[PDB]
Design an enzyme around this catalytic site. Sequence first.
Site, PDB file in Angstrom:
ATOM      1  CD  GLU A   1     -35.493 -49.839   6.262  1.00  0.00           C
ATOM      2  OE1 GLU A   1     -35.166 -49.715   5.366  1.00  0.00           O
ATOM      3  OE2 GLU A   1     -37.290 -50.708   6.361  1.00  0.00           O
TER       4      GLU A   1
ATOM      5  CB  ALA B   1     -43.904 -43.905  -1.708  1.00  0.00           C
TER       6      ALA B   1
ATOM      7  CG  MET C   1     -42.884 -47.056   0.771  1.00  0.00           C
ATOM      8  SD  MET C   1     -43.145 -47.570  -1.503  1.00  0.00           S
ATOM      9  CE  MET C   1     -44.012 -48.591  -1.334  1.00  0.00           C
ATOM     10  N   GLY C   2     -46.709 -47.074   3.570  1.00  0.00           N
ATOM     11  CA  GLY C   2     -47.827 -47.262   3.878  1.00  0.00           C
ATOM     12  C   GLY C   2     -49.238 -45.788   3.604  1.00  0.00           C
TER      13      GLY C   2
ATOM     14  N   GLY D   1     -45.964 -44.622   7.141  1.00  0.00           N
ATOM     15  CA  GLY D   1     -45.143 -43.064   6.392  1.00  0.00           C
ATOM     16  C   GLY D   1     -45.158 -42.749   4.513  1.00  0.00           C
TER      17      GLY D   1
ATOM     18  CG  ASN E   1     -37.194 -52.613   0.923  1.00  0.00           C
ATOM     19  OD1 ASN E   1     -37.617 -53.292  -0.427  1.00  0.00           O
ATOM     20  ND2 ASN E   1     -36.346 -50.977   0.364  1.00  0.00           N
TER      21      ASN E   1
ATOM     22  CE  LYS F   1     -37.747 -53.614  -3.355  1.00  0.00           C
ATOM     23  NZ  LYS F   1     -37.074 -52.308  -3.375  1.00  0.00           N
TER      24      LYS F   1
HETATM   25  N1  LIG Z   1     -40.194 -44.601   0.064  1.00  0.00           N
HETATM   26  C1  LIG Z   1     -39.526 -46.099  -0.562  1.00  0.00           C
HETATM   27  O1  LIG Z   1     -39.856 -45.735  -1.920  1.00  0.00           O
HETATM   28  C2  LIG Z   1     -39.827 -47.740  -0.505  1.00  0.00           C
HETATM   29  C3  LIG Z   1     -39.910 -48.542  -1.861  1.00  0.00           C
HETATM   30  C4  LIG Z   1     -39.629 -49.924  -1.396  1.00  0.00           C
HETATM   31  C5  LIG Z   1     -40.273 -50.348  -0.042  1.00  0.00           C
HETATM   32  N2  LIG Z   1     -39.219 -48.927   0.592  1.00  0.00           N
HETATM   33  C6  LIG Z   1     -39.588 -49.965   2.226  1.00  0.00           C
HETATM   34  O2  LIG Z   1     -40.962 -49.909   3.219  1.00  0.00           O
HETATM   35  C7  LIG Z   1     -40.721 -49.885   4.208  1.00  0.00           C
HETATM   36  C8  LIG Z   1     -41.425 -48.181   4.782  1.00  0.00           C
HETATM   37  O3  LIG Z   1     -40.719 -47.186   4.252  1.00  0.00           O
HETATM   38  P1  LIG Z   1     -41.638 -45.271   4.270  1.00  0.00           P
HETATM   39  O4  LIG Z   1     -40.187 -44.851   3.579  1.00  0.00           O
HETATM   40  O5  LIG Z   1     -42.404 -45.704   4.142  1.00  0.00           O
HETATM   41  O6  LIG Z   1     -40.431 -45.128   5.758  1.00  0.00           O
HETATM   42  P2  LIG Z   1     -40.689 -44.092   6.431  1.00  0.00           P
HETATM   43  O7  LIG Z   1     -39.567 -43.852   6.952  1.00  0.00           O
HETATM   44  O8  LIG Z   1     -41.721 -42.781   5.273  1.00  0.00           O
HETATM   45  O9  LIG Z   1     -42.161 -44.511   6.988  1.00  0.00           O
HETATM   46  C9  LIG Z   1     -41.639 -45.385   8.292  1.00  0.00           C
HETATM   47  C10 LIG Z   1     -42.251 -44.450   9.515  1.00  0.00           C
HETATM   48  O10 LIG Z   1     -41.790 -43.635  10.285  1.00  0.00           O
HETATM   49  C11 LIG Z   1     -42.611 -43.008  10.278  1.00  0.00           C
HETATM   50  N3  LIG Z   1     -41.627 -41.487   9.979  1.00  0.00           N
HETATM   51  C12 LIG Z   1     -41.012 -41.316   9.043  1.00  0.00           C
HETATM   52  N4  LIG Z   1     -40.816 -39.737   9.550  1.00  0.00           N
HETATM   53  C13 LIG Z   1     -40.965 -39.650  10.809  1.00  0.00           C
HETATM   54  C14 LIG Z   1     -39.757 -38.384  11.852  1.00  0.00           C
HETATM   55  N5  LIG Z   1     -39.017 -37.287  11.439  1.00  0.00           N
HETATM   56  N6  LIG Z   1     -40.678 -38.560  13.261  1.00  0.00           N
HETATM   57  C15 LIG Z   1     -40.819 -40.054  13.656  1.00  0.00           C
HETATM   58  N7  LIG Z   1     -41.785 -41.102  12.941  1.00  0.00           N
HETATM   59  C16 LIG Z   1     -40.749 -40.802  11.022  1.00  0.00           C
HETATM   60  C17 LIG Z   1     -43.716 -42.620   9.017  1.00  0.00           C
HETATM   61  O11 LIG Z   1     -44.113 -41.896  10.347  1.00  0.00           O
HETATM   62  C18 LIG Z   1     -43.381 -43.868   9.573  1.00  0.00           C
HETATM   63  O12 LIG Z   1     -44.560 -44.574  10.700  1.00  0.00           O
HETATM   64  C19 LIG Z   1     -39.224 -49.922   4.564  1.00  0.00           C
HETATM   65  O13 LIG Z   1     -38.959 -51.576   4.320  1.00  0.00           O
HETATM   66  C20 LIG Z   1     -38.558 -48.971   3.169  1.00  0.00           C
HETATM   67  O14 LIG Z   1     -36.862 -50.145   3.039  1.00  0.00           O
HETATM   68  C21 LIG Z   1     -39.395 -48.265   0.700  1.00  0.00           C
HETATM   69  O1  LIG Z   2     -34.545 -47.060  -1.985  1.00  0.00           O
HETATM   70  C1  LIG Z   2     -35.732 -48.318  -1.566  1.00  0.00           C
HETATM   71  O2  LIG Z   2     -35.891 -48.443  -0.503  1.00  0.00           O
HETATM   72  C2  LIG Z   2     -35.397 -48.845  -2.458  1.00  0.00           C
HETATM   73  O3  LIG Z   2     -36.702 -50.719  -2.749  1.00  0.00           O
HETATM   74  N1  LIG Z   2     -35.814 -48.922  -3.779  1.00  0.00           N
HETATM   75  C3  LIG Z   2     -36.326 -48.965  -4.979  1.00  0.00           C
HETATM   76  C4  LIG Z   2     -37.646 -49.599  -4.987  1.00  0.00           C
HETATM   77  C5  LIG Z   2     -37.766 -50.208  -6.306  1.00  0.00           C
HETATM   78  C6  LIG Z   2     -36.945 -50.626  -7.197  1.00  0.00           C
HETATM   79  C7  LIG Z   2     -35.988 -49.910  -6.611  1.00  0.00           C
HETATM   80  C8  LIG Z   2     -34.906 -50.219  -5.657  1.00  0.00           C
END
Ligand SMILES: NC(=O)c1ccc[n+]([C@@H]2O[C@H](COP(=O)([O-])OP(=O)(O)OC[C@H]3O[C@@H](n4cnc5c(N)ncnc54)[C@H](O)[C@@H]3O)[C@@H](O)[C@H]2O)c1
Ligand SMILES: O=C(O)C(=O)Nc1ccccc1
Lengths: 312, 309
Positions: free
Chosen positions: A273, A131, A11-12, A9, A105, A187
């Site tokens: 989450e 992201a 972040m990936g 998604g 997270n 965090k």
């Molecule tokens: N996005 C951020 O800025 C951020 C920052 C720090 C940590 N994180 C953490 O990283 C981890 C991943 O977060 P992410 O933002 O990459 O999540 P995301 O929801 O973008 O992706 C997660 C999964 O869900 C799938 N997905 C997304 N939308 C979908 C839909 N409409 N239908 C079906 N599948 C769908 C994606 O393809 C992926 O496989 C989480 O634990 C999150 O809390 C995210």
């Molecule tokens: O929204 C999130 O899930 C997340 O982790 N945000 C975040 C990222 C960097 C610093 C602070 C918050």
Amino acid sequence: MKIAIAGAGAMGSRFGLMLHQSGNEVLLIDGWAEHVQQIKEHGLQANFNGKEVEAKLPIVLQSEVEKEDQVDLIILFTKAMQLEKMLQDIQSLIKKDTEVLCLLNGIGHEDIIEKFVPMENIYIGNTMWTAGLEGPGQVKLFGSGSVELQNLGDGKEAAAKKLADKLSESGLNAHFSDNIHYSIYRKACVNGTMNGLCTILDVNMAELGKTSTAHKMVATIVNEFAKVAAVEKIELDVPEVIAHCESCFDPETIGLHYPSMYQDLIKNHRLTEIDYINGAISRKGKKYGVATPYCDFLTELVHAKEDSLNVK
Amino acid sequence: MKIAIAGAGAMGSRFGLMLHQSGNEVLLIDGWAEHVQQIKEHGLQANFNGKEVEAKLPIVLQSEVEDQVDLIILFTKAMQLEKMLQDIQSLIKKDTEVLCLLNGIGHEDIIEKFVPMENIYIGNTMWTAGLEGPGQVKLFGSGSVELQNLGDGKEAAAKKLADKLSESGLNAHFSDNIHYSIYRKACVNGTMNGLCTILDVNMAELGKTSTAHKMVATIVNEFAKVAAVEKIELDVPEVIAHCESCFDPETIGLHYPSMYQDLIKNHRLTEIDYINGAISRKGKKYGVATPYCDFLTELVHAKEDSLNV
Ligand SMILES: NC(=O)c1ccc[n+]([C@@H]2O[C@H](COP(=O)([O-])OP(=O)(O)OC[C@H]3O[C@@H](n4cnc5c(N)ncnc54)[C@H](O)[C@@H]3O)[C@@H](O)[C@H]2O)c1
Ligand SMILES: O=C(O)C(=O)Nc1ccccc1
Ligand SMILES: NC(=O)c1ccc[n+]([C@@H]2O[C@H](COP(=O)([O-])OP(=O)(O)OC[C@H]3O[C@@H](n4cnc5c(N)ncnc54)[C@H](O)[C@@H]3O)[C@@H](O)[C@H]2O)c1
Ligand SMILES: O=C(O)C(=O)Nc1ccccc1
């Protein structure tokens, strides 16, 4: 090396893109069929720091992973609720030497990961990168970030440092930590205040910071996290963690953004989450005899909000 | 008898209208200038159970009071109560009955600054009303009133007052335990109003969520712990069930509580400090943990701030 991004998604997709741009071989694995098909046909498209970028990254549906297939490093980046099912679907990829890194997270993911992966191969941490997933095959990547990680297996410190260096070679700014549990809780306090409060109040982080009661809500929640963490012999510096949470209020850092949980529920009508953040603190509290009322109530409110929007 | 309605919004308009239709002489007193003007020029208009009704009721701005009455019924929002009492002091004679039917807890304290104790009557009501705009109300459903004298020896006067209100269809009853009754209705207002406001749902929608029961029960238990220090022993199971009866779409469930109308629809400050906030204040005073009431009150104030109210 061969790197699989399990959960491609927002972040990936970031990590995969950055790892690919430095010459690593990257396989994306994902459960969203429309997203996988888009990437197959048109590549992964990113607004990357303002610039339109396209990369043809190989991608496979998680249910179609080959037991014949094999990588050196799996980076987990699903949402917490998808983690188990993702691990079930890709287990055949987990060989003797495969490193498995979890940067989700939330709290406690090791326990699930240990059902599928030998202990010595598990690395965990968190990240300050951000992201956005705009639609299938489309991501928006802005800002700076970092990664912290640590090995969970005895004697794997050097392997962990090497892994951090490798990520750093792709610009991911990854560091080894000798106290990853402190770092995860810290965090988690940020995620345990900004995410749920923004979602329930329908504000961004700067708007939250402008309210007269934000400081009191943040400090009360952070105290609850710290009381639970102390039972596990982790002593959070509460004043520093409160200030670290409130630094998200600043428009010059991340204040103008909506946290991920807000994007999930309010914007995209997806489940959050919350059970892995505030909910993890509630469930620990009950088990340890520590009162965690703000975590209980915020969790309840977020679930109610999900229900009121008819989310899964 | 000459009755002043001090705070002629949705509920004050209902009571005034019903009291006037039975031949009582009614004076409305209000602080919303546009509303006062409308009523002066076009009377008070109501959709009353589906019938369009108009009544030409005398009305005065609270700052221009001059003009005695026998009964003052307070029906401001809690935040407007003190200023209203300051502006209409000249109407409070050794004679005058003062009845407070506001939601929330503890309004006697402020009323006692302006009114002799023997003339204070308090209660609550299950009637509903909506203020659609200046000079316009929508009135549906049934309702009731409960009230009690605060002054020693005023029981019979209280019963008479209840009978009077009942003569205008208000279904008012004397209670010998008004504090129990106030707390019990405050539990309703302390669950439905804030939760509906923060979650952006009506009461039936709140009832459909998986965690509503837990949130309601926890809140009600906090109210009960505080009330017990004051020797009021709420029947917690019955109070919880009474709260949850608001969830029924066939009774009141389709409605949005007053606090929701205030803040989410009209961008106005809420009565939260007099409901959940009053329980928080008491918890501080009695050393009782009231974390749900603290957090809900904080969340509502943050919501107000975010809408720049
Ligand atoms: N996005 C951020 O800025 C951020 C920052 C720090 C940590 N994180 C953490 O990283 C981890 C991943 O977060 P992410 O933002 O990459 O999540 P995301 O929801 O973008 O992706 C997660 C999964 O869900 C799938 N997905 C997304 N939308 C979908 C839909 N409409 N239908 C079906 N599948 C769908 C994606 O393809 C992926 O496989 C989480 O634990 C999150 O809390 C995210
Ligand atoms: O929204 C999130 O899930 C997340 O982790 N945000 C975040 C990222 C960097 C610093 C602070 C918050
Ligand atoms: N509405 C209900 O169904 C209901 C039911 C039971 C109890 N209550 C309680 O009764 C009390 C009075 O409630 P209400 O519903 O009649 O309050 P309301 O908001 O309808 O009116 C209260 C006062 O505010 C003034 N006002 C209203 N809108 C205004 C505006 N836009 N600008 C300036 N002034 C304005 C009104 O003229 C009135 O004087 C409260 O304590 C409430 O919680 C209400
Ligand atoms: O909205 C309010 O402020 C209110 O008190 N509602 C209500 C009315 C009658 C019965 C139950 C709740």
